[PDB]
Structures are given as C-alpha cells and as structure tokens.
Point group: D2
Chain length 207, copies 4
C-alpha cells in the first residue's frame, strides 16, 4: 500500500529541548512543517504509482521534485527528532558516544574543533538547508544539503542540524549563530553513536 | 572605489506596511538582513579586486558565491522596498499602473487571474527564494529565483515578492498563503508601472 | 509491466539527413546513444518499482537521477527523430507549419530572426544539453535544458535540437556553429506544426 | 595586467599519447578547445575589470558563468596535460608514486580497487564533466565536477580525467568505457606524486 507514511511521535514533550529550542518552535516544526512533508509525500507517491503503471515517464519525472522535497523533508526531520534530546539527559553527554567521538577527535583533532568546523558549515549555508555529520566509507565528513535534500547517496547520516529559518527564527530571529551555539546542548549522542556503528540500512529503519 | 555600497534609510516607518507585514518583520528585514547583505557584498568585492589584479582565477571562482548571494541580496531587497508602500497610499491602487495592468489583462485574462498565477508560483517555491513579474522582450512572465539569485539575465524586473521565511514567519508562522494574499495590499503599482515602461538598466538605478 | 520501453524505429534511413547530419552520426546516435538511455531507463524503473512498492523513500530519491537522465534521454531523442526529416521532403519546408510560423513571426519578427535567437541559445549552452522551441500558454519561448533534462514542466515541446557533442562532433569537430547552421535544412516543420496545434499530452503520445 | 593568460605548451608531441589518445584528439583538444577557454577567459576578465571598477553588480553577476566555465576550462586542461605522459615512459608506472599509491592502497584496499572506483565515478558522470583524485585534509577522495567546474573549493587536485565527449569521441565513439580503460596507460604518476606531496597553491602554480 503505497503512501501510508505517518508523522512519527516525538520522543519527548514539545518543551523538552528548552532553553535551546523553544516549545513553540518544536510544536510548529513537528505538527505543521513535518506533518506537511508527510502528507504531501504520501500524495506524490500515490500519483507516482499511477504514472509508473501507465508507463508515463513525463509524469514520473515531473513528480520527482515533490517526492525529493517531501520525501527528503520526512527523512531529514525524522532523523532530526531522534538525534535531539533534553540537555539534562545523559544522552546529551558526548560520553554516550565513545566510538564516534574517538573518530571525531581522530579526524578534527577534538570535539571542539569539530564543532567549530560544523558551525562554519551550518552558517555558510545560503538559503535553506541542513548540515550533517556523515560516515563515508570508514571516515567522517561534514556535508551540507540544500532545501530538504536528504543524504541518500550512500553515506550514513550520523546526525543532522536543520538550518531552515523556521528551525530557529521565532526564538533567535536573525541570530542563527546563537541557534547553532545552543543546539549542541541538545544533540543526542547516544543516537549518533548508534548510527555511526551501524550501516545505511540501520540508520533509515526508523522510517 | 570598489565595494562602497550603503543601505538607504527606508522611505516609510517600520510599521507602515501593517497589517500586511508587521513592524518587527520590516525592521529586522531591513536593518539586519538587508544590511548584512550589503556588508558582506562590500567585503567580497574588495577581496575579489585583489584576486582580479593578481590574475588569481581559483580565488575569483571561489568568491563568486559570496558576490552572487550578497549582491543578489542587495539587488532583490532594494527592488522589494521600492515596490512596497502603505496600503492607504494611492500608489497601492493598481489604477496607478494603467499600461502594466492592461498588458497583465491581455496576458492572463485579468489582474485577478494574474494574482492567482503569481501566488501559485510563490507558494510553489521550495526552500528560500523570490517570485517576480518580469518583462521579457515585449511580453510579461512570472519567474521564480532561488535563494538570493537576482533577475540579471536580461529581463526587466517589474516587481518582486520575497518568499524567504524571514519575510513572513514572525507574523504568519507557516501560513505563507495568507502572507501572499495580504501582500497585494501593499504592492507599489506606481513603481511597477515605471519599471514596466523603462529598460533593464533603468530598473537597476535603485542601486546607485 | 514496468520498464518495457523499446527503441523507436527511425522514420527514415540512417543516411536520410545528409549532408546536414552524417549517416555515421545518425546510426551511432540512434543505435548506441538513444538505445543506452532506453536500456538504462528500463533498469532504473525496475529498481524504482521495488523501492516504491516497499515504501523505501531513500532509495527512490537516490534513483531519481537515473530516471530523469535516462527517461529524459528517451523522451528527448524520441522527439528529436520525429522533428527531423530529409532536406528534400516538403516537410522540411517551413511552409508546412503555417500556424507555427505565423506565431514565430509575431514573436521574433521573422523566421530568420527566430533562427538567429535559437542559434544563440544553442551555442550558449555550457556542456551538454538541448535547445527547444516550446509553447507555453498560447505563446512561444526558446528554452535550453541541461544534459538530458526533458521539457516536462507543463509547456508543450514544439521541436528540439541536440547540442551534445555526440550529435555533431564526428562530422563538424568543434564547429558547433556549422552544425546549427545546417540542421535547419532538416527540421521537420510538419511535425513542429502538429505539436504547436496540439496539447502537452498530444506531443508525448509518440512515446 | 588583467586577462593575460596563454595556452601552455604541451609537455610532449601531439602523437605522444598513442595508442590511448589519438594525435587528432590531442591536437584538437589543445589547439582548439583549450585555446578557446583561454581566449574567452581573458576577454571575460577584462570585461569584469570594468564592471568591478564601476561597482556594477548586475554585470559582475552576469559575467560569473563565463569566468567559471572558461577559467575552470583553463585550470582543468592545464592540470590534465601535465598528468598525462607517453605510455612507454616510466612516469606512467605507478611505482613512480610510492607515497601516493601507498595512501591509495590504504584507502581503497589496492590500486586496482581504486581504479575500479574511479572508473565507476567517471562513467557515472551525466553529461559533460571531469573525474578527480583529490587530497582533502590528509585523506584521498574521488570527486566529479560538472562541465568545466574546477576543484577550487579547498581540496588539492592530484590528477584529473576529462569525460567530455570531445576527449574521446573521434577515437572511441560512444565507447567511454574503453577510453577510461586505456587512459590508465598514459596517467603521469610522477606528476600525481608531486601534487600529492605538495600544497593547494603549489598545484595551481602551473597557471
Ligand atoms: Mn525543518
Ligand atoms: Mn528577504
Ligand atoms: Mn543525443
Ligand atoms: Mn576537454
């Protein structure tokens, strides 16, 4: 049965990521923005199934933008909620990710140096997009994606940070640097460790 | 003197576009977002001048993104402020644009049908971008641009509407459709008419 | 039966477009290049069908490039063969396209001015791509597409000219301007007229 | 003095790369294609100089495509000629690159596995473009670039392979796989080794 995705439940209350991310943002981001991606993804997929059966290639290609945008939106936000957690949770302690943080230190020198590099990448995004820590081969890389484009080229997403203005604007206004500075407090390193130790299939099973 | 752009004071109060666009949005949009494009444009242009004089092509190519993004940011927002005005102004009455609205009607059937088409294009933008009515040849077209990419390919911008989330989110949240419905109330048709009757360089005089 | 596309028969012999386009090129272009797009399209669709039925969105998005590229390749070349014909055919006479040429003249002033504009667009393409005359609304526009991107966004393709180097290089070498000058002699205006008078679905019926 | 680039002399005769790349191709590729990038780059830079002094930003943005395409064209081909050499030369033996090949083996397992991965990347390019082995940080990566886009983002080019159809079509026709198989015979590993050991600036000193 094509196109039966549903909006996943949050692992925490809307206000659980405060003070880094306000309850108003988490509620809008999940119940409105993510909801819209799920809904529009299901509709595009059913329409695609029709075109595919009719061997209608122009319609299939014309539907790709909706499927990438809403499918990517669903993929990215689903990953996002799971790699966030309350700042007071032990999951927010990078000690929860011994293997990943060891490789981060191996690659950037230290967790702090990595955070600086990641922050630069996030703040350098022009327009809407995401920043990701990914596993490529056996190594780690910082990559950015445009709009709702997902990391589907083969790399394993370890964690993502949303840099769309709706992710921060109500609370931080134009101050995206402050959003980035504060989001580190609510990164779920237990999730990141899990993804780092598993393969691409493992990371996407939550969908 | 390379890279000496400045942001002119807005010709109306921050709250002058209410209730279509809130005072907080206009203030942030102009004094923070647009100024930042101006600052970073000037910085990129000066770095570029060094690279140009040195025939350093790798650095020039590496700087293109900053110049297009910030240069486009300054161009687009400069056009935007000039094609917005208070809802109570006679300039917001489409009767201020007889020649343009006649061509709009000839093209889309009516101004109403044009607004619906334009709205569909604006709401269809994925991510950040702008929607434009442009003059191409002698005809009119609706086009969209991504991020801060400007309309510099030869067509004449007639007016633009910003669909970046910072353009509406504080007031409308995710409700971008209401933003688009309401922005028609504060479109400066006098400005649109002037641009419609002039050429591409005439439109970009706003950058002087 | 997903992915059962076949290479369409040419409407003429391989040498029918001489001297504008050599027999060698027509043979390679059809039997190798277009064929490879068809084969790889079928392969992509079979893989996509699996991902779709399985609601595997990451795989679907990863497959989009192959479907757009090969699907677009199939669409574009299918249109191309049908809007070419022998130079001696009455179909190559623009008098075969009265309604289209009338609209062309209204838009660019004359057929010659249109050809000059189209030529500039074709020669201005960086890398691989196509130039198209399209109908959008009741009006005409010249558009270019990159690689094998097809005109599937809603406008009606009227005719296309391939600017990939494989379309001309064996015969014209780097001299693409000469290729463009000569291809006007073999444009099937009868086909162009038919597309101009019909709708978007009508144009894609050849598939 | 803005825009005074010149077409570099080849390090060998036009026929020196046979049988892998024909004399006809090397001569056309260098004397026509590369020459045109140089000339159009110089002209664009001189025009840019005017627009820059006039603080004419629309004109500057409009000129970017020409500067990236022709500038990238000049950069890429300049690197290309230097990382090619006669097949009978010991410089074409990977033993000429002990440090680089050691790092390749560490990364892909073996030189053969690297060649397979590189070939896959090269053959996977849609449209016109280049494949590169680059050094980013301390590691090696295979990347592809579209059209004439250069590797200018910070990574150090180690060697490049041109996958534009003009690089092979006269000799290999549609057989890009055969082109890739055969180009390994004329890769200059001595040059590759030098670039691998050197700086980003050092690699571009060739300009
Ligand atoms: Mn988001
Ligand atoms: Mn804006
Ligand atoms: Mn072709
Ligand atoms: Mn080349």
């Amino acid at each position: 049965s094509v196109g039966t995705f549903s909006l996943p439940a949050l692992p925490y209350a809307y206000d659980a990521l405060e003070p880094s991310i306000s309850a108003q943002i988490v509620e809008l981001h999940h119940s409105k923005h993510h909801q819209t991606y799920v809904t529009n993804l299901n509709n595009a997929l059913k329409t695609y199934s029709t075109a595919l059966a009719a061997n209608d290639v122009p319609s299939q290609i014309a539907l790709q933008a909706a499927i990438k945008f809403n499918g990517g939106g669903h993929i990215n936000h689903s990953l996002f909620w799971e790699n966030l957690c309350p700042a007071s949770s032990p999951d927010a302690d990078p000690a929860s990710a011994p293997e990943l943080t060891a490789e981060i230190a191996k690659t950037w020198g230290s967790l702090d140096k990595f955070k600086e590099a990641m922050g630069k990448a996030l703040l350098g995004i022009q327009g809407s997009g995401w920043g990701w820590l990914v596993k490529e081969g056996s190594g780690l890389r910082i990559v950015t994606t445009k709009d709702q484009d997902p990391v589907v080229g083969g790399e394993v997403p370890v964690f993502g940070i949303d840099m769309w203005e709706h992710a921060y604007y109500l609370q931080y206004l134009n101050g995206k640097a402050a959003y980035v500075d504060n989001i580190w407090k609510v990164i779920n390193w237990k999730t990141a460790e899990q993804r780092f130790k598993g393969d691409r299939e493992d990371a996407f099973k939550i969908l």
